[PDB]
Structures are given as C-alpha cells and as structure tokens.
Subunit: 68 residues, 2 copies
C-alpha cells in the first residue's frame, strides 16, 4: 500500500529495534507534507516494518547513495 | 522483486527519465558491496524501475531524511 498523503503520515509510530543487518531494503514513501517515511523490510523470519530517518544507520544507508 | 546480490549489483542499468512527481516511493536495496541501489515505482499506469542514486533529486529525497 503506497499511500501518498499529507499531514497524516502513514507511519506515526516507527519500529525502533530495526537493524540494518536484518533490513533487506528500505522504502521511502512519497508524502507531500510529511517527513521522510522509511520502511525497513527485514529478512526471512521478520516482517516489513516502518522506521524513522532519526536512525543513524539509515542516514548512512542513504549516505552511500550520496556521491558514492 | 528485490534480488539479493553483492559485488554484482542488481541495477547495472538504471532508468534515467525518472521524475520525483511521478515516483510513488523509492526502494533502497541493501548491498554491502554496492553503494546504494534505488528503485522508483512510478504512479498509476507506470511500473517499477530501478534508478541510480547519482540522481540529484534522489539525493534531495534522502536529504529530507537527513536530520529532520
């Protein structure tokens, strides 16, 4: 469900025990008026969870996108 | 379908005419030996395509995740 919506953000609460080693990939949702919505899909036994860009490893994930 | 690869990178060819207004969400694949793999799924009739993190608006998309 890719919900591009404003003010009410798809992720109000975020998963905070997320580990990049467990994250298979990240998903950044498009919200016209919300902060960067980031989803972490975790490997095999876990589910897909929504997390927050406050997470420092998240920023590094995207830092890898930046200038390589 | 995010393929699990390393060193060999999933996206060797990337969609180049991707627009932020057309992207519904971005998906960053976790590669420990590739510097960021980004997928854009475009709105309504469009499909899912892989793009490159070198894209300037992409970097800004993630800048919105950077300290906010």
């Amino acid at each position: 469900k890719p919900v591009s919506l404003s003010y009410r953000c798809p992720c109000r609460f975020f998963e905070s025990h997320v580990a990049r080693a467990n994250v298979k990939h990240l998903k950044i949702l498009n919200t016209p008026n919300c902060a960067c919505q980031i989803v972490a899909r975790l490997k095999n036994n876990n589910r897909q969870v929504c997390i927050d860009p406050k997470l420092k490893w998240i920023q590094e994930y995207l830092e890898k996108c930046l200038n390589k």
